[PDB]
């Protein structure tokens, strides 16, 4: 199995 | 803080989406879809049972930390 962490930032 | 949403496809893929509780899940879907290289209309996302909306958010669906998201393929025809 493969684990990847993705971070998304959204400006209000 | 950031929330960790585990997205799984149809294989042993365990991607951890570390986004904010107010970040639209639509972007989450697009992010994964873009990484795979497919159109957002070629696949379908589901949360436990109900499908995710294009305006849904982690805080809207009452998603907790370390939750799971299902990804399915759209029928050919």
Stretch (H or E) spanning A7: strand A2-7
Q: Which 45-64 residues of chain B touch chain A by CB within 8 A? A: none
CA distance B42 to B21: 26
The reply to whether residue B20 touches residue A9, judged by beta carbons under 8 angstroms, is yes
Obtained via which technique? NMR
The reply to whether residue B15 touches residue A8, judged by beta carbons under 8 angstroms, is no
Chain A hits for B31, CB-CB cut-off 8 Å, are 6, 8
The reply to whether residue B20 touches residue A3, judged by beta carbons under 8 angstroms, is no
CA distance B72 to B43: 6
CA distances from B58 to A12, B52, B77 (A): 16, 10, 32
């Amino acid at each position: 199995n493969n684990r990847d962490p993705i971070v998304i930032s959204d400006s209000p | 803080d950031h929330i960790n949403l585990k997205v799984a496809g149809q294989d042993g893929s365990v991607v951890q989406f570390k986004i904010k509780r107010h970040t639209p899940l639509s972007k989450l879907m697009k992010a994964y879809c873009e990484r795979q290289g497919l159109s957002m209309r070629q696949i379908r996302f589901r949360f436990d049972g109900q499908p995710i909306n294009e305006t849904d958010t982690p805080a809207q669906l009452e998603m907790e930390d370390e939750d799971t998201i299902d990804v399915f393929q759209q029928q050919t025809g």
